[PDB]
Amino acid sequence: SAAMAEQRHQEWLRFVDLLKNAYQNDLHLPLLNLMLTPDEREALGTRVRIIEELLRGEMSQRELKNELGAGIATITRGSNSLKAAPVELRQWLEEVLLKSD
């Protein structure tokens, strides 16, 4: 249903915009503690590390599984989503997540 998809999209943007405003008001931490579960906070921290290591290029995917405790399916999702991302985002992530050499 296109109508239901439109409703889901509007609801998602409401979250995005709410959080934007929370950051501007220094309310982001309490908002994220309200809106997410502990397990989802843990998952998001792990996903940042997966991205950082995929961009770095030192560890193979099976080495990452072993080192981070994340399964191969999880790592593969990360890799495919990173390959699909806009170049501008990948370039920015390389600037922010990796140390200068």
Q: What residue ranges bind ligand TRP (CB under 6 A)? A: 34-37, 47, 50-51, 74, 77-78, 81
Q: Which of the listed partners (ligand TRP, a copy of itself, none) does 28 bind, with a CB threshold of 5 to 8 Å by partner kind?
A: a copy of itself
Beta strands in the chain (DSSP E): none
d(CA 88, CA 100): 18
Cβ 1 to ligand TRP shortest distance, Å: 21
Residue type, 56: R
Q: Residue-wise over 47-73: b if at least 16 C-beta within 10 A, else e? A: beebbebbeeeeeebeebbeeeebeee
Cβ 64 to ligand TRP shortest distance, Å: 10
Residues at the interface with a copy of itself (CB under 8 A): 8, 10-12, 14-16, 18-23, 25, 27-35, 37, 40-42, 44-49, 51, 77, 81-82, 85-86, 88-89, 92, 96-97
